[PDB]
Structure 1
Amino acid sequence: APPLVNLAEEKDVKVTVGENMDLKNADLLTDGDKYYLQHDATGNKEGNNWENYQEQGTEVTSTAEGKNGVWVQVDLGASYPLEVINLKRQVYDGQATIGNGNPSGQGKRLKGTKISYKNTAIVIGNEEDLSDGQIVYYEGNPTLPDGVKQPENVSKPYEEAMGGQWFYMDYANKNGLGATELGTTKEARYIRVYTENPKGAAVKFMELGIYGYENEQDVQSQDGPRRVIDNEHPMMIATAYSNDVYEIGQEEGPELQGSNTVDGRWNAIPDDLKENNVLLLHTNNLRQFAPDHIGQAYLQAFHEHGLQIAYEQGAPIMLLGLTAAATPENGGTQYNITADMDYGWLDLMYRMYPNMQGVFNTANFWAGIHPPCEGSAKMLEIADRFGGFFVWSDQDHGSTVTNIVSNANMKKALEKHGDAFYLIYKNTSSNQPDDLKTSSFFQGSWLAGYTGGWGMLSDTWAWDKQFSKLWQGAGSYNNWQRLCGEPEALLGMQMMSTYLGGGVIYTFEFPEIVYGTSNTNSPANTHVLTELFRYIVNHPAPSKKEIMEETKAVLYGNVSSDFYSGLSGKPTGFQIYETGRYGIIPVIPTWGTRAEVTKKLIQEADKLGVTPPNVLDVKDKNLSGQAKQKYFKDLYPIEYVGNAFADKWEGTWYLYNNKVNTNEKQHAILPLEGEEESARLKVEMEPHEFMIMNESGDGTAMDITLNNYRVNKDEIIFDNKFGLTWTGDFSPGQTTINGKLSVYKYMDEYNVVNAPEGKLSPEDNELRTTTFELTKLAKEPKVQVVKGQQPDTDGQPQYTEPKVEFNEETGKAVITIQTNGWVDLSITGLEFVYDENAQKIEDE
């Protein structure tokens, strides 16, 4: 029970009207129903047809000749601090037709004649006759109570809307229509609404919501940001997709994909990671294509129910604000019930639910550009007003940011609210090599100060575009099979590369694979995401200052996808690098001209007390095919030798094998700390492995964490040994397509961490070799397993004990270990001696 309530619903209200007015169905004014849906139990269809919009409400009819104006008054029974009023009257003159929307033949929109009421006013006070009345809203010339002055500024009529109209307690803020700071209240017992129907003596009041507090003590206040998102406070987002089943009034919380629940997903998060996690409520295909009355009812009911369950658990929430250009803005689609968003309702969710933090936008521009920018500009302002945030997820082929800023309203909203705005990549279209350019754009936007930060959405749909079985191409498998195919450790490699670039947001799909089903944690979540995210929570990423200090070159403009080849790495579609030598290579998109972006970057650098990096156009002669390698190699000295990825950040080495689906060993030769500069570690790894190494500093010891967790899908998914149905079709009496049910069944029965009787432990028992060669040493060093991933219930080990071989002649120690999972090693008793033959750390 949060402190802001609908007092009109909560209290035993009394409804009255004036002299020469008749009142019918007073109870409907405060019943919490704006839509009067009748077929919730059958998906809001009568047979195969969406239910018609039937407007019910409190009818007030003037019986005075020559005076069609009426009023209705609610007595809350006592005085309460009021913050928001929601007024809805009959929207349509006659009936709405369920008409064609966008796309044609699929999307439904109401069409008909909307009413523009006139002589509307809202007056509140503590006297039953409102002799002490305070004007909340005033349009036209309705006669106010004796003692109440006319306002100097009077409003003009508006068109009645599906969600009603929203009023606040500051008459100076757009004549009462302007959203106030949290906790802006006026005390009142009595709320009177004047209205004249342009046609006739009767007004139908569908709903009057009166939001306020039990007492002054409960009144809320804006107390800085709801969340900090930065290197010291990173954020993991998990998508909570509706399973597309919901009935207004249901007692149980909204069902999510894969038998998950909002509270169940929250309680699955390890306690020490909960403060760095959020849940994203996603309407998915819930009431997809529905006309306005059904779409808005379900968008609100689904999100409110989720928010309430999250509030009880202390779980912070983001809502999906916009996908597939499904916005109420002119030209929007109805691909999602986000098409029925009421900005006044979104404002109310921030006031009502202190755990409401953010809005998410993804995958719009395929379906339209300007309408989703118009919507995003409004929702970014709302989020920032309440100290919340806005996350935009997309891959940038070159036009994504340019499109965002091509919209005048979105450009202006970013100028004012940019610190609450975050861009994260989205590698779904892994076959288009824009992964590395997107990271550059999003890092550059943050670095120059256009945005609050950047991060990642790694999507296992990326596997589907290229690969199936381990080491193999996509072949002719069903896409739902290929979705299950991605190596778990590869998600950690992506998380490590985003971390090293000062990324602060981490998200993964498909959620039922990467996070889990049935309110359990998946193998990916248990053995990779929670393990590395804990590291990232406890070891801050580079700050903006730390990235700016280490950045020698910032690029401007539409960088070529393949620019990264010969520098940081060939774009794979999987958001990983061949080397950390050059970092991400920030590229500022066309937020402004090159000169404008340069002034912005210099001001940002100056605020941080750092030398501004040089800004080069992507077309600069230094950045040509033939010149870029010498140019970058001269700016950034080599830190290690080899074809594996390595980067040294804050005295720690970060490595991985960078082969996505080719079985090749790679190595990194690292110059080691301590008095003996000739000291070397050669690490050699097979694919799907990342490593964190932290030297004692004096040359005697090092700690190494490696993680190469990988489940084998070849037999259970691709050979389909359990005969799952992998198709995009529905079976009779199912609301979910067979391929998706097959993903859930795989995660529920065949791929279970700590598998109970009758379920299968993960196929993760085939081990792979890591070797460490240390030169040149006086004697054999000591290696031990400080801690290692333990068996599943099948009792099979995830690692073997490390073996050490020391050649006393060459002074080379070789440490060998076999793993599938994580191990923490400690190497001690190192005595390095001068090695005239040590690998030189220099370019070829």
Structure 2
Amino acid sequence: VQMRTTINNESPLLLSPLYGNDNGNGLWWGNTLKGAWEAIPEDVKPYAAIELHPAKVCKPTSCIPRDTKELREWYVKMLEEAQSLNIPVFLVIMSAGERNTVPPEWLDEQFQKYSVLKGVLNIENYWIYNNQLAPHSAKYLEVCAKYGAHFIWHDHEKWFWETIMNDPTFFEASQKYHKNLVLATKNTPIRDDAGTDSIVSGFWLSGLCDNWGSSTDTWKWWEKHYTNTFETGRARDMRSYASEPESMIAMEMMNVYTGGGTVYNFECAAYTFMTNDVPTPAFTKGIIPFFRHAIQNPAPSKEEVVNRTKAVFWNGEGRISSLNGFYQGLYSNDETMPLYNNGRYHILPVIHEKIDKEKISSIFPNAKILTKNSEELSSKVNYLNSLYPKLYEGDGYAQRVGNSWYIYNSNANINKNQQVMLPMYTNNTKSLSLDLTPHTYAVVKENPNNLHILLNNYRTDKTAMWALSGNFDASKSWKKEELELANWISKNYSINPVDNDFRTTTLTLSGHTGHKPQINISGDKNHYTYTENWDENTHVYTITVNHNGMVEMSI
């Protein structure tokens, strides 16, 4: 059977979600299916699909998809509309512990009837686990495999993922139907961010799913009690989910991309996608630019990830869920939030206990296998440092990925700059330094005879939204107050974004071989300025870029 969607490093997948209303045209946030697909740029469409979440159609609880006549009617309504418009869709059929979801036979019928039906999603169970979720998922995965479709499971936490893959039914189904399975993170619950990346990407490296990825959830900002950027002492509300910096959404995608991930999903869609069929700046200037990067520059392949791996942690003699400082001193000081401090070790794979040690040796013949009982963990950092050399200086995040550096400022909600000094691997220049304000990322690619540099620091000022009068408490999710916020977004944030405050990224090329570089530079229109400086004696070129948005250069 031919796959309904081609998903791999050369063909990643962007999911954009719509939500059922038990009223009106059947969709929340003023959106339509036609408008959702209109929002997807033409170059992105071959690598995109629309997620259909029944949301308020579900009864008794919004978003919990208990099988009902109204649920099936809604799925069919949306399938009919998508088929008429040739829009690729995935249905959310499992969430939040629901045991009585649509029958596999019903899903089988829908695959037969609708060529636009590309697969299904199970989303969010870490707070409401039960022993039916893994077996039910296994049965739906089998149906997916019959039709060349994908089963996409978004979930989180070390103990949780350990538990799922210990299920004999799901472990067996994963081994058979890995082609049709995508396992993915969902960092809403502000715990275990580093461990979850390690385990989920570890499943992919272990051959249990052919793709992994993420649901990048701006509700984390609300969970943290954060408000306007850098602000303390204000009560959280729904405006918090519209307050994670736009470029920081892209930095979360970078963690997935550089780890070999290939599937990207997002919440909360009022901020991250569209309201009233008007796409948001977080979508157009945050998610889309990074996803375009991922289309144009394939992520590391499985074999590239295997070959750069110097050590793995195997859960076979005690599990990573029982080592709650593991990532301290290595690359995450704070597993409640997604940003990494250090790129030196990449994402360190965690291999599940159900994979035999002999199999690990087979997959990673050159890697050290660490376990909880490894003597070396008595000096964990020194030992891993003996395997992964130090590649740069400074306090920013930098990761070497083939012939590129992937870089960001790792401060989520503290207004402090970071610097990196990056040795270079070609004689285009000897070293490259960056001074980066918060919510700035960079990618530097070394071609044989030029450097290509991407900068992006896009962050709108959220002050206006936070200044509004009204009740926007999260208790009004799925109610009129939430729609008021969505309406305001469509007329303020999305059409007059407050994005004219520029911040400075300073790029210094030391030992740039020839004479004054002649730069080729472009960027978001009206959103950058720059000054150049060349020292002919020291062969140092400096470009000072003042920007709020994307800037690209070839040197």
Q: Same fold (TM over 0.5)?
A: yes
Report how far residue 780 of structure 1 moved. 6.8
- Alpha-carbon deviations, 1:508-561, whole Å to 9, x = none? 100121111122221011112111111101211111111111111111123234
SS in 2 for 1:387: coil
Match of 2:360 in 1: 601
CA contact (8 A) 1:729 1:738 kept: no
Please tell me whether residue 577 in structure 1 is matched to residue 331 in structure 2. Answer: no
Cα distance in structure 2, aligned partners of 1:363 and 1:707: 31
CA contact (8 A) 1:783 1:825 kept: no
CA contact (8 A) 2:65 2:98 kept: no
CA contact (8 A) 1:727 1:738 kept: no
Cα distance in structure 2, aligned partners of 1:566 and 1:508: 30
Please tell me whether residue 472 in structure 1 is matched to residue 231 in structure 2. Answer: yes
Cα distance in structure 2, aligned partners of 1:256 and 1:424: 25
SS in 2 for 1:272: coil
Match of 1:816 in 2: 544
Please tell me whether residue 710 in structure 1 is matched to residue 459 in structure 2. Answer: yes
CA contact (8 A) 1:569 1:577 kept: yes
Report how far residue 675 of structure 1 moved. 4.5
Report how far residue 774 of structure 1 moved. 2.3
> Against the structure 1 CA distance between its residues 365 and 617, is the aligned structure 2 distance closer, same or farther, given a 3 Å change threshold?
same
Match of 1:768 in 2: 503
Match of 1:244 in 2: 22
Report how far residue 762 of structure 1 moved. 0.2
Match of 1:278 in 2: 49
Aligned length: 547
Report how far residue 810 of structure 1 moved. 4.7
Q: Which amino acid aligns with 2:220?
A: A
How does 1:450-489 map onto structure 2 within 5 Å? 450-466=208-224, 467-473=226-232, 475-489=233-247
Pairing partner for 2:438 from 687, 695, 710: 687
SS in 1 for 2:93: strand
Report how far residue 776 of structure 1 moved. 3.5
Match of 1:660 in 2: 412
CA contact (8 A) 1:263 1:313 kept: yes
> Against the structure 1 CA distance between its residues 786 and 437, is the aligned structure 2 distance closer, same or farther, given a 3 Å change threshold?
same
Pairing partner for 1:300 from 72, 81, 85: 72
> Against the structure 1 CA distance between its residues 424 and 676, is the aligned structure 2 distance closer, same or farther, given a 3 Å change threshold?
closer
Q: Which amino acid aligns with 1:538?
A: Q
> Against the structure 1 CA distance between its residues 496 and 379, is the aligned structure 2 distance closer, same or farther, given a 3 Å change threshold?
same
Cα distance in structure 2, aligned partners of 1:709 and 1:365: 32
In structure 1, stretches of 5+ residues that fail to align are: 1-222, 247-253, 329-338, 756-760, 791-796, 828-844
Pairing partner for 2:2 from 207, 224, 227: 224
SS in 1 for 2:348: coil
Report how far residue 622 of structure 1 moved. 1.5
Report how far residue 623 of structure 1 moved. 2.5
Cα distance in structure 2, aligned partners of 1:729 and 1:427: 21
For CA contacts below 8 A with separation 6 or more, give which structure has more relative contact order: 2
SS in 1 for 2:115: coil
In structure 2, stretches of 5+ residues that fail to align are: none
Please tell me whether residue 787 in structure 1 is matched to residue 522 in structure 2. Answer: yes
Cα distance in structure 2, aligned partners of 1:369 and 1:702: 52
Q: Which amino acid aligns with 2:357?
A: T
- Alpha-carbon deviations, 1:274-304, whole Å to 9, x = none? 11111111111214218x9995211111111
> Against the structure 1 CA distance between its residues 306 and 487, is the aligned structure 2 distance closer, same or farther, given a 3 Å change threshold?
same
Match of 2:187 in 1: 427
TM-score scaled by length of structure 1: 0.62
How does 1:71-86 map onto structure 2 within 5 Å? none
> Against the structure 1 CA distance between its residues 652 and 675, is the aligned structure 2 distance closer, same or farther, given a 3 Å change threshold?
closer
How does 1:67-466 map onto structure 2 within 5 Å? 223-245=1-23, 254-289=25-60, 295-328=67-100, 339=101, 341-396=102-157, 398-430=158-190, 432=191, 434-466=192-224
Q: Which amino acid aligns with 2:184?
A: I
SS in 2 for 1:567: coil
Q: Which amino acid aligns with 2:133?
A: P
Q: Which amino acid aligns with 1:281?
A: L
Report how far residue 317 of structure 1 moved. 1.4
Cα distance in structure 2, aligned partners of 1:325 and 1:580: 36
Report how far residue 612 of structure 1 moved. 5.2
Match of 2:389 in 1: 637
Pairing partner for 1:727 from 447, 450, 473: 473
Cα distance in structure 2, aligned partners of 1:692 and 1:620: 36
Please tell me whether residue 737 in structure 1 is matched to residue 479 in structure 2. Answer: yes
Cα distance in structure 1, aligned partners of 2:166 and 2:390: 40
CA contact (8 A) 1:684 1:770 kept: yes
How does 1:493-504 map onto structure 2 within 5 Å? 493-504=251-262
Cα distance in structure 2, aligned partners of 1:676 and 1:226: 43
CA contact (8 A) 2:227 2:243 kept: yes
CA contact (8 A) 2:59 2:65 kept: no
> Against the structure 1 CA distance between its residues 402 and 810, is the aligned structure 2 distance closer, same or farther, given a 3 Å change threshold?
closer
* Segment drifting more, 809-818 vs 308-317: 809-818
Report how far residue 718 of structure 1 moved. 1.9
Please tell me whether residue 588 in structure 1 is matched to residue 345 in structure 2. Answer: no
Cα distance in structure 2, aligned partners of 1:294 and 1:671: 55
> Against the structure 1 CA distance between its residues 572 and 471, is the aligned structure 2 distance closer, same or farther, given a 3 Å change threshold?
farther
SS in 1 for 2:242: coil
SS in 2 for 1:726: coil
Pairing partner for 1:614 from 368, 374, 377: 368
- Alpha-carbon deviations, 1:136-190, whole Å to 9, x = none? xxxxxxxxxxxxxxxxxxxxxxxxxxxxxxxxxxxxxxxxxxxxxxxxxxxxxxx
Cα distance in structure 1, aligned partners of 2:300 and 2:510: 31
TM-score scaled by length of structure 2: 0.93
CA contact (8 A) 2:126 2:155 kept: no
Report how far residue 392 of structure 1 moved. 1.1
Match of 2:491 in 1: 749
SS in 1 for 2:43: helix
- Alpha-carbon deviations, 1:463-495, whole Å to 9, x = none? 11222121124x442420211111000011111
Higher Cα radius of gyration: 1
Q: Which amino acid aligns with 2:167?
A: N
Cα distance in structure 1, aligned partners of 2:66 and 2:174: 32
Please tell me whether residue 535 in structure 1 is matched to residue 306 in structure 2. Answer: no
Q: Which amino acid aligns with 2:349?
A: P
Report how far residue 270 of structure 1 moved. 0.4
Report how far residue 260 of structure 1 moved. 0.8
Percentage of identical aligned residues:
29
Cα distance in structure 1, aligned partners of 2:11 and 2:514: 43
Cα distance in structure 2, aligned partners of 1:676 and 1:747: 45
CA contact (8 A) 1:454 1:504 kept: yes
**Which protein has the bigger helix share?**
2
Report how far residue 601 of structure 1 moved. 3.1
RMSD over aligned CA atoms reads: 2.4
> Against the structure 1 CA distance between its residues 370 and 675, is the aligned structure 2 distance closer, same or farther, given a 3 Å change threshold?
closer
- Alpha-carbon deviations, 1:725-767, whole Å to 9, x = none? 313566xxxx942442233023211112xx3xxxxx1011100
CA contact (8 A) 2:54 2:65 kept: no
Cα distance in structure 2, aligned partners of 1:644 and 1:402: 32
CA contact (8 A) 1:654 1:692 kept: yes
CA contact (8 A) 1:777 1:811 kept: yes
> Against the structure 1 CA distance between its residues 244 and 410, is the aligned structure 2 distance closer, same or farther, given a 3 Å change threshold?
same
SS in 1 for 2:201: helix
Cα distance in structure 2, aligned partners of 1:815 and 1:786: 11
SS in 1 for 2:543: strand
CA contact (8 A) 2:65 2:71 kept: no
